[PDB]
Design a protein around this ligand. Sequence first.
Ligand SMILES: CCCCCCCC(=O)OC[C@H](COP(=O)(O)O[C@H]1[C@H](O)[C@@H](O)[C@H](OP(=O)(O)O)[C@@H](O)[C@H]1O)OC(=O)CCCCCCC
Ligand SMILES: [Cl-]
Ligand SMILES: [Mg+2]
Length: 310
Amino acid sequence: MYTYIQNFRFFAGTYNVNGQSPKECLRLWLSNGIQAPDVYCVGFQELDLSKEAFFFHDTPKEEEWFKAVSEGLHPDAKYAKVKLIRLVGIMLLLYVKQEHAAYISEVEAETVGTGIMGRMGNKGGVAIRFQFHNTSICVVNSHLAAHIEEYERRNQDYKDICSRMQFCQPDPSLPPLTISNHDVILWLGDLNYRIEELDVEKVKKLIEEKDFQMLYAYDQLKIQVAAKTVFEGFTEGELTFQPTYKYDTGSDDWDTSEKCRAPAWCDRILWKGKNITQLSYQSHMALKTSDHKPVSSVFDIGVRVVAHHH
Ligand SMILES: CCCCCCCC(=O)OC[C@H](COP(=O)(O)O[C@H]1[C@H](O)[C@@H](O)[C@H](OP(=O)(O)O)[C@@H](O)[C@H]1O)OC(=O)CCCCCCC
Ligand SMILES: [Cl-]
Ligand SMILES: [Mg+2]
């Protein structure tokens, strides 16, 4: 057989929904003035903040948000639901245009909790891996530890998801699949990294000034990536949108509660692999159900397709 590179459009979305049910149309996130994607990868955090969900019960939030995503996908294509995976409030959905579904195989999904006692699902990651034509792809959705001062725990949460996440395989001879053994890796989530050093007032001023390059020099993820403690070999696109946390629900105002939180680029998308180009990296201010804003990225990804023999 012969293979060649064919480009496909992948949308990746992350949204911390602060335990709410969906109240708004999700087109503003999922299909807001873009071409119909070939593949949709849509991730949530804090789908359900209840004690019942914490002890691993089913939640109606799963279907509510799944239906809401399905209704917000681009109207020009019928999308096939490939896979859903959830651990407590961390949920990842994979859809492909119907015409591409026959070329999806080896779908596996797994979860790793890294929250309470290093094991519960209040924080952690979920992942769907699959083969599209002859290219292997792993999409990870993580919710890492909160708070400015817990950066080391975030680093450790990342390492723990990487070491413990194992996928089934067709061959039991071989060692199980890890996240890193894929041609393409897309990692998204509420990674929860904050702005070091600067005080809340200085952070908010820089944002009003739109000096994102300067604010970014103090971003914990940037610093940790430079120090090689996390996301080794991954790329993130330039942040040109304002911090996505923390807002008063129903508004675009910064948190006016007692905790008065410092803004942060909590919500991030990164990637690793050959033949990837980022076409966009954006937040979506118009959605106000949550104290976070959703984030999206569209990629052109080269996929190995089998040439037809005649
Ligand atoms: C093995 C059994 C042991 C049980 C021990 C009980 C465990 C417990 O109390 O905390 C569990 C978690 C604690 O939040 P945690 O994940 O750090 O989540 C973050 C914090 O709430 C943080 O304040 C907030 O930031 P903000 O403040 O900046 O917005 C972030 O949005 C959150 O991501 O709360 C939950 O997940 C909610 C469900 C817990 C129910 C259990 C009650 C007994
Ligand atoms: Cl918007
Ligand atoms: Mg919350």
